[PDB]
């Protein structure tokens, strides 16, 4: 390898115990209250998700090699598709070019496996 | 050319693969382009073909199939029982067994 210009960071990977995890935009990495990096990439392969972190070079000298990872978050609805359903009594006027579908007209269903 | 249709979500915690397909009676009519989260409400921004909205009635409902997944927000390294003197090595990998998924509190 060759020495970088400045602001060098080291990459570290994290395996997700639950597949299908998603990461929020601009997620940070902390250690004892201090931000030490950020989450750059996230790849799905089969039934496992891996996270790629970017910790500062100087900050990784303080994290023990036997430390654990704690990921906070909430359960959300991960949707894959959107489908319009023909109503029981359809309207003559088609969908207008600038239409809005109210939330009461939306049906959230769980997929089958 | 495409036209934009917006859709409100019954759940604020809704994510979607970018460029997910929008279908009507088996055939694809467009794709979702963006999701706006103003406040605690989610609004989908669809983009469907111009010649496809003539077949979709104005009073058509929307079905969205998906799964309940974990929406991570932050990653934190936790000091162990007894920290080892050797620091984290570059390109190290922490296995899924050493990962703890916790739900955050809400007031």
B39 min Cα distance to partner chain A (Å):
15
Resolution in A: 2.9
Which residues in chain A have Cβ-Cβ distances shorter than 8 Å to B24? 83-84
DSSP helix/strand/coil, A33: coil
* Deposited experimental method: X-ray
Query: With the C-alpha atoms ordered A100, A102, A105, A109, is the resulting torsion angle positive or negative?
Result: positive
Q: How far apart are CA A39 and CA A13, in angstroms?
A: 10
Chain B: residue nearest A109 by CA? B65
DSSP B49: E
* Inter-residue contact B66 to A77 (CB < 8 Å): yes
Query: With the C-alpha atoms ordered B94, B97, B100, B101, is the resulting torsion angle positive or negative?
Result: positive
CB contact under 8 A, A87 and B61: yes
Q: Which of A81, A96, A105 to mutate to test the interface with B (most CBs of B within 10 A)?
A: A81
Q: Which residue has the tokens 């922490």?
A: B94
Q: Which residues in chain A belong to E strands, given as ranges?
A: 9-15, 22-23, 28-31, 34-45, 48-56, 68-79, 82-85, 100-101, 106-110
∠ Cα B56 B62 B66 (to 5°): 135
Torsion angle of the four alpha carbons A91, A92, A93, A95, in this order, in degrees rounded to the nearest 10: 50
């Amino acid at each position: 390898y060759f020495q970088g210009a400045m602001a060098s960071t080291d990459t570290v990977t994290v395996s997700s115990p639950r597949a299908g995890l998603v990461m929020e935009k601009g997620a940070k990495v902390k250690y004892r209250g201090i931000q030490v990096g950020k989450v750059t990439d996230i790849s799905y392969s089969g039934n496992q998700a891996r996270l790629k972190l970017a910790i500062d070079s100087g900050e990784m000298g303080f994290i023990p090699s036997n430390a654990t990872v704690r990921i906070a978050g909430n359960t959300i609805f991960g949707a894959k598709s959107v489908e319009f359903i023909p109503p029981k009594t359809p309207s003559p006027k088609p969908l207008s070019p600038n239409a809005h579908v109210a939330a009461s007209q939306v049906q959230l269903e769980l997929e089958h496996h």
